[PDB]
Write a protein that binds this DNA or RNA. Structure first.
Ligand code: ZN
Ligand code: ZN
Lengths: 62, 814, 115
RNA sequence: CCUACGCGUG
RNA sequence: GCACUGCGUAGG
C-alpha cells in the first residue's frame, strides 16, 4: 500500500537528514522531526504525501 | 431530596447520600462531591462552584474542565474555595472551645457545618462537668483532610498576618527549622486532635505515627518557602582544606533530620561525591523558564540539548512482507508502532510533566486502615537485610549515575569496594542520610505515541544500599506462584492459564475488570510512596531497630521521593513522585495499586445506604468498618482478617506494577457492596489528583473471552490436548513494527540477527489460532522470513522454522 | 585495585577542582551569619554564584524577565555579558526583537555577572 | 550452575 | 543510555 511505503520513505529520509548533520541546526531539525512525526501519525494519504514532499525538498535544498 | 450524611447508630453507619439562617449546602455535601466524583453527575460540585464565585457557568461549557491534566486551570477554581474552607476550620476550633467551656461531650460531623462555617447541631450532646468537655473530631477532620490540600486552604498562612491582600511573609533564606511554626499551625487548626503530632518524624513511635506526622507535615510544608527544603550543608576542615558537606536534610514530610555521625577512605569519597552539596556550591546560578519546577544551579558553561534519532528501516523484511501479500490497502493489520524522533527540548519538556504532582494530604484514618489491610497481602513473603556477599546484580554493564558515570560503570565500583566496605556503607546509611543525584536520559523505544519517554538513573550508592536493604523481600515476591502480585510468574508454559484460573478462584458471579493509572509515576502522591516504602520495610521487625528503619526511610525519600535531578547538565528539585530507577519501582507500584483498590472498596462499602442492604453480614461488616476507621485507634486484627477474606472472596486481583485485572461479584458491585469503575475514578480524583477516563478501562461480562488486555497482551481460549486453555497473544502491529524497525543498523542485516525473529515468533505464535487469518499469516510470514534468512546465511536450525518449537513453549509441560 | 586507586585519585581531583571553583568570601559570611552553621543547599548558589545563566523559551519571556543590558533577579543586579542561541552562536542584543524573533534559534541562553 | 548476545511494567 | 521480571541463543 502507499501508506506503509510513504511512512518508510519518510523514516529513511529523516535518517539520511540526521546523518547529514541536520541536527546541528536546532530549528531545521525541529521542523524535520515535526514533519516526520506528522507523517507517521498521518491517517490521510494526501497529507502524508505533502509532508513527505516537504521533507524531500528540505533534503534537496542542501 | 438526597443529601450527603455521615451517620452512626446501632442500625446503620457510614458516609453516604441519604434520602431526607442556614445555607442550602453543608460541608458534607462539598466533601461528598469532591470525594465521589462522577463526570456525568457534577451537579452539586458545579452549583457549589458557582454560588460561591469560583467559576461562572460558562466554565462548565468547556469540556474536560474537571480533568487536571487537560485543564490545569481547575486547580485555580478549587483554590477559590480554600480560604472559605480555612475559615470553617477556624470556626470549628471556636465551637470546640465553647463545648469545653460548657462541659458538653459530643461528636462533630461535616453534616452540621454550613459552608459559611456555622455549626447548627446540638444533638448527641451530653452535658458534663464544665471544663471537661471532650469533642470527637476523628471522623470530621479525617474526612475533610483531602479538601484542605485540594482547595489549598492554608495559602493565606503564607502572607503576613494571615491575609491574602497583604504581601507575602519574607523568611530569612538561611532559616530552615520551622518546628515552632508547625506547632503553632497545629495548635491553631488541629488543636483538638488528641493524637500527639511530631513535627520531626525522627521522634515517631512507630510506622503509623510516622505516617500520621508525614500526613500533617505535607500540609504544613506548603506554607514554608520552597528554598528552605532540601539538603542541609556545612563547611568543615578536612586535611586542612575546606569541604562543603551535607550534615542533614529537610523533608517536606519528615521535617529536619540531622546526621548522627557528622565529623569535621574510598567510602568517604563516595559519600562526598554522591552528595550534591559540592556540585551545587561549585555550580553557577540557573533560572529556567521552560519549566515550573525549582532550578538549583548549572554545572556546565553551556546548556545541553539531546535529541532522539530516527529509527532504522529494515528494507529486506518490509519487501518480504509486501511480496507475501501483507500491508495491502484496507488490511486490518497495519504499522502503528514506530521510532519517534524528538527535538532538543524534549527531555526538559517531559520533566515539566512533574508539575502534575501536587501536595496531597490523605485521610489518615482511612490510609492507616488501608495499609493495615494491605500488609495482609504481603504476609507470606519473607524479608530482611542481607550482607554484601548475598547481593545479586543481574547486569553490571549499566551506568553508575552522576558523577559516577564519568569514571566507570558498576563493575568498577563493585570491584573497588570489598564486602566489608559495602557493609560499612550500609551501616552508615542506617545512621545518616546521603542525598544523591539522579540523571534523566531519553529512552530509545518502539512506542505508538509521539510523546518521549525518560529513564532515571540513580547513583551507585543508592542502588547498592537499597539492594542490601530490600533484595531478600524482592526475590521472595518474585519466587511465589498463586499470589495477588504476579511478578516473576512467566506467561509461557501455561503460566497464563494458571494465573487466570487463580483469579477465577471461587466467585459467585464472576465479572472481569481492568484499568490503568494515568500519569502514574508523575502524579503518584508522596504519602502513598511513603506508605509503600513502610510496607516493604515492615519485614525488618527483628533485623532493624526503629531508628535504623527511620533513617532508611529518610534515605529512600532523599534518593527517590525528592532528590536532585540533572537534566542537560542543570540541577533541579523534583517535586515528588517515584523515580523510574528505584530498586523497588515495580513492587512499590504494586503496593500502591493494592492500596488504591482497597481504598476504592472501602469507599464503595461506606457510600452504600446500609438500610437498603438486605444482608445482615454485610451490614455488620460495614458497621465494624466504620468502627475501625473513625472510632477505634488501635488496629483490630480480627476485623482486618475478616475484611481481607471478604475482599479475596469477592475481589480477586492480579497486580503488576500499575496494571491490574480484577474478578468481582456482579451482584455485590451492583448493590454497591464492592468497588466498581466509578469508585476507582473517584479515588484517583481525590487521592491521585488525576482524572481517570472510562475509555481506557474495560469490563468483561463473559469469563470465556478473558481479560481484554493485561501486560499489553490479549487473552484467547484455544484447544490443546482435549483441554481448553487460555493463551496470550499480542497486537500484530507491535510485532510487525519490531520486525521492520530496529534501533541499531546491525540489526537491519537479517543474516546477523536470526534470534530477534525467533523471539518475535515465540511471542506471536498464539496468533495462529485467532479467527482472523491475517493474524496467523503474521506467524507464517515470520517463519518464512526466518527460513529465508537461514538460506541466505548458508539440521539444528530447522527447529527455528518448524512450528513445533514455538508450539512447545506454550504447553504446560514445563 | 589499580583501578580503585585511579578512582580515588579521580574523586579527589574532582573535589579539589570544585574547591578551586569555590570561593569563601561570601560562604564564610553566610556561615558566620548562621546561628547553627547549617544552611539550605539551594540558597548557596543564589547568594554566592558569580555567574547567572538564564534559559529563555520565547520573546515574551525575554521581555518579562531580562530585557535590558541589566536586570534584577534573586534580589541582586545582574549585567548581561553574553546571549548565545540553541546553536551556541553569539546572538547580539540588537538582534533580539519581536520582528526578528522568528529568525532566532530559541531557546536563548543568557550569561550575566553579578553587579 | 556461571558469562555474553537477543527479545514485558514504569 | 535506569530498576527489576520472564524467555530463547552459544561456550566453561
Ligand atoms: Zn510521630
Ligand atoms: Zn533488617
Amino acid at each position: 500500500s502507499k501508506m506503509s511505503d510513504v511512512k518508510c520513505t519518510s523514516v529513511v529520509l529523516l535518517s539520511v537528514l540526521q546523518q547529514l548533520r541536520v541536527e546541528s541546526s536546532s530549528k531545521l531539525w525541529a521542523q524535520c522531526v515535526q514533519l516526520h512525526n506528522d507523517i507517521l501519525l498521518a491517517k490521510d494519504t494526501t497529507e502524508a504525501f505533502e509532508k513527505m514532499v516537504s521533507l524531500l525538498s528540505v533534503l534537496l535544498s542542501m | 431530596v438526597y443529601r450527603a450524611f455521615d451517620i452512626y447508630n446501632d442500625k446503620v453507619a457510614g458516609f453516604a447520600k441519604f434520602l431526607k439562617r442556614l445555607t442550602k449546602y453543608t460541608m458534607a455535601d462539598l466533601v461528598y462531591a469532591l470525594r465521589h466524583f462522577d463526570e456525568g453527575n457534577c451537579d452539586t460540585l458545579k452549583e457549589i462552584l458557582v454560588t460561591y464565585n469560583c467559576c461562572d457557568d460558562d466554565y462548565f461549557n468547556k469540556k474536560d474542565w474537571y480533568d487536571f491534566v487537560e485543564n490545569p486551570d481547575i486547580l485555580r477554581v478549587y483554590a477559590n474555595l480554600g480560604e472559605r474552607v480555612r475559615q470553617a476550620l477556624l470556626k470549628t476550633v471556636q465551637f470546640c472551645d465553647a463545648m469545653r467551656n460548657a462541659g458538653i461531650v459530643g461528636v462533630l460531623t461535616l453534616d452540621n457545618q454550613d459552608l459559611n462555617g456555622n455549626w447548627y447541631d446540638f444533638g448527641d450532646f451530653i452535658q458534663t462537668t464544665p471544663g471537661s468537655g471532650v469533642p470527637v473530631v476523628d471522623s470530621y477532620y479525617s474526612l475533610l483532610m483531602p479538601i484542605l490540600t485540594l482547595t489549598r486552604a492554608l495559602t493565606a498562612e503564607s502572607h503576613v498576618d494571615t491575609d491574602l491582600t497583604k504581601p507575602y511573609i519574607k523568611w530569612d533564606l538561611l532559616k530552615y527549622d520551622f518546628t515552632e511554626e508547625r506547632l503553632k499551625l497545629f495548635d491553631r487548626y488541629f488543636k483538638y486532635w488528641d493524637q500527639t503530632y511530631h513535627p520531626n518524624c525522627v521522634n515517631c513511635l512507630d510506622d503509623r505515627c510516622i505516617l500520621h506526622c508525614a500526613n500533617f507535615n505535607v500540609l504544613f510544608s506548603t506554607v514554608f518557602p520552597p528554598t528552605s527544603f532540601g539538603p542541609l550543608v556545612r563547611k568543615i576542615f578536612v586535611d586542612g582544606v575546606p569541604f562543603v558537606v551535607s550534615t542533614g536534610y529537610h523533608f517536606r514530610e519528615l521535617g529536619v533530620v540531622h546526621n548522627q555521625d557528622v565529623n569535621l577512605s574510598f567510602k568517604e569519597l563516595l559519600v562526598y561525591a554522591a552528595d550534591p552539596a559540592m556540585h551545587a556550591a561549585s555550580g553557577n546560578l540557573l533560572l529556567d523558564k521552560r519549566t515550573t519546577c525549582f532550578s538549583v544551579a548549572a554545572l556546565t558553561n553551556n546548556v545541553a540539548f539531546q535529541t532522539v534519532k530516527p529509527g532504522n528501516f529494515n528494507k529486506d523484511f518490509y519487501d518480504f512482507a509486501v511480496s507475501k501479500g501483507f500491508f495491502k490497502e484496507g488490511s486490518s493489520v497495519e504499522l502503528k508502532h514506530f521510532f519517534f524522533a524528538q527535538d532538543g527540548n524534549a527531555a526538559i519538556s517531559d520533566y515539566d510533566y512533574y508539575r502534575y504532582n501536587l501536595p496531597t494530604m490523605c485521610d489518615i484514618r482511612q490510609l492507616l486502615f488501608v495499609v493495615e489491610v494491605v500488609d495482609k497481602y504481603f504476609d507470606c513473603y519473607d524479608g530482611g537485610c542481607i550482607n554484601a556477599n548475598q547481593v545479586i546484580v543481574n547486569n553490571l554493564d549499566k551506568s553508575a549515575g552522576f558523577p559516577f558515570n564519568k569514571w566507570g560503570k558498576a563493575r568498577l565500583y563493585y570491584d573497588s569496594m570489598s564486602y566489608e566496605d559495602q557493609d560499612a556503607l550500609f551501616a552508615y546509611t542506617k545512621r545518616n542520610v546521603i542525598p544523591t543525584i539522579t540523571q534523566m536520559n531519553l529512552k530509545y523505544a518502539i512506542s505508538a505515541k509521539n510523546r518521549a519517554r525518560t529513564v532515571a538513573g540513580v547513583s551507585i550508592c543508592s542502588t547498592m544500599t537499597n539492594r542490601q536493604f530490600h533484595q531478600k523481600l524482592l526475590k521472595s515476591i518474585a519466587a511465589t506462584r498463586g499470589a495477588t502480585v504476579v511478578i516473576g510468574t512467566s506467561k509461557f508454559y501455561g503460566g497464563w492459564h494458571n494465573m487466570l484460573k487463580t483469579v477465577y478462584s471461587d466467585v459467585e458471579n464472576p465479572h472481569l475488570m481492568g484499568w490503568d493509572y494515568p500519569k502514574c509515576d508523575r502524579a503518584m502522591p508522596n504519602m502513598l510512596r511513603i506508605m509503600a516504602s513502610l510496607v516493604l520495610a515492615r519485614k525488618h521487625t527483628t533485623c532493624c531497630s526503629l531508628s535504623h528503619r527511620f533513617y532508611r526511610l529518610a534515605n529512600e525519600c532523599a534518593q527517590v521521593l525528592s532528590e536532585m535531578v540533572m537534566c542537560g547538565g542543570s540541577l533541579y528539585v523534583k517535586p515528588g513522585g517515584t523515580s523510574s530507577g528505584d530498586a523497588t519501582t515495580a513492587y512499590a507500584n504494586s503496593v500502591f495499586n493494592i492500596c488504591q483498590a482497597v481504598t476504592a472498596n472501602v469507599n464503595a462499602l461506606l457510600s452504600t445506604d446500609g438500610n437498603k442492604i438486605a444482608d445482615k453480614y454485610v451490614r455488620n461488616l460495614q458497621h465494624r468498618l466504620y468502627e475501625c476507621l473513625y472510632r477505634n485507634r488501635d488496629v483490630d486484627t480480627d476485623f482486618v482478617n475478616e475484611f481481607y477474606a471478604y475482599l479475596r472472596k469477592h475481589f480477586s486481583m492480579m497486580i503488576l506494577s500499575d496494571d491490574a485485572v480484577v474478578c468481582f461479584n456482579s451482584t455485590y458491585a451492583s448493590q454497591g457492596l464492592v468497588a466498581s469503575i466509578k469508585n476507582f475514578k473517584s479515588v484517583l480524583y481525590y487521592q491521585n489528583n488525576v482524572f481517570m477516563s472510562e475509555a481506557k478501562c474495560w469490563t468483561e461480562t463473559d469469563l470465556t473471552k478473558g481479560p481484554h488486555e493485561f501486560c499489553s497482551q490479549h487473552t484467547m481460549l484455544v484447544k490443546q490436548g482435549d483441554d481448553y486453555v487460555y493463551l496470550p497473544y499480542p497486537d500484530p502491529s507491535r510485532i510487525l513494527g519490531a520486525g521492520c524497525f530496529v534501533d541499531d543498523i546491525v540489526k537491519t542485516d537479517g543474516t546477523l540477527m536470526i534470534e530477534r525473529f525467533v523471539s518475535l515468533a515465540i511471542d506471536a505464535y498464539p496468533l495462529t489460532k485467532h479467527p482472523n487469518q491475517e493474524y496467523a499469516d503474521v506467524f507464517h510470514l515470520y517463519l518464512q522470513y526466518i527460513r529465508k534468512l537461514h538460506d541466505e546465511l548458508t539440521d539444528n536450525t530447522s527447529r527455528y522454522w518448524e512450528p513445533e518449537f514455538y508450539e512447545a513453549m506454550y504447553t504446560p509441560h514445563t | 585495585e589499580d583501578k580503585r586507586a585511579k578512582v580515588t585519585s579521580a574523586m579527589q581531583t574532582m573535589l579539589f577542582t570544585m574547591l578551586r571553583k569555590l570561593d569563601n568570601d561570601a560562604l564564610n559570611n553566610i556561615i558566620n551569619n548562621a546561628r547553627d552553621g547549617c544552611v539550605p543547599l539551594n540558597i548557596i548558589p543564589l547568594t554566592t554564584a558569580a555567574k547567572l545563566m538564564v534559559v529563555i523559551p520565547d520573546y515574551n519571556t525575554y521581555k518579562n524577565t531580562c530585557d535590558g543590558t541589566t536586570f534584577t533577579y534573586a534580589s541582586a543586579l545582574w549585567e548581561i555579558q553574553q546571549v548565545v542561541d540553541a546553536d551556541s552562536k553569539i546572538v547580539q542584543l540588537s538582534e533580539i526583537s519581536m520582528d526578528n524573533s522568528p529568525n532566532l534559534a530559541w531557546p536563548l541562553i543568557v550569561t550575566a555577572l553579578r553587579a
